Write a protein that binds this ligand. Structure first.
Ligand code: HEM
Length: 149
């Protein structure tokens, strides 16, 4: 129900994972830095996290091979319209082979919504992206990807 994200060197982020073994904290490696993703109903364990509310979810955050974040900046005025489109989402992605999980994350510390998808492999995501299933913006959207460590 909340998701906290933080960024930094994998070496630094690993210390947080090990400090909190009873929390489900997922570490993945990206090009610029590594990421921790912590889903919980409780409080953050990160210094100055990015905090999000979960507005749609399918699947468990476990040991995915690949993660993709669509980072979509939405104006304050556009938020109601943007969020309400998710009730109308096709609902196909969660049925594609190699899919593990999706979170649609409402940002509480910025304007940048995250559509987080977790996949068994990078190929599973590539197959989805090539398939049939798949102003209110403050700046252009961008995608970040991360791999299992
Ligand atoms: C290119 C990176 C993107 C990825 C990986 C991505 C991923 C997704 C996923 C997984 C869904 C759910 C599909 C389903 O329910 O079957 C979705 C739907 C949606 N996406 Fe994206 N998306 C991206 C870009 C964007 C951008 C730039 C926007 C800006 C508006 C956007 C707006 C939406 C909206 C409003 C929905 C709700 C369903 C719909 O109306 O199509 N997406 N997207």
């Amino acid at each position: 129900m909340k998701v906290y994200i933080t960024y930094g060197t994998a070496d630094f982020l690993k210390t947080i994972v090990k400090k909190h073994p009873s929390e489900n904290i997922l570490l993945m490696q990206g090009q610029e830095n590594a990421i921790l993703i912590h889903e919980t109903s409780g409080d953050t364990v990160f210094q100055a996290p990015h905090a999000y509310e979960v507005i749609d979810q399918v699947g468990e955050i476990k040991h995915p091979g690949f993660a993709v974040l669509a980072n979509i900046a939405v104006t304050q005025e556009g938020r109601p319209l943007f969020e309400n489109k998710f009730k109308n989402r096709a609902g196909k992605v969660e049925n594609e082979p190699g899919f593990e999980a999706i979170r649609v994350l409402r940002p509480l510390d910025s304007d940048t919504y995250v559509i987080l998808t977790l996949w068994e492999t990078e190929r599973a995501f590539q197959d989805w992206q090539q398939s049939d299933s798949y102003s209110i913006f403050s700046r252009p959207s961008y995608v970040t990807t991360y791999f299992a460590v």
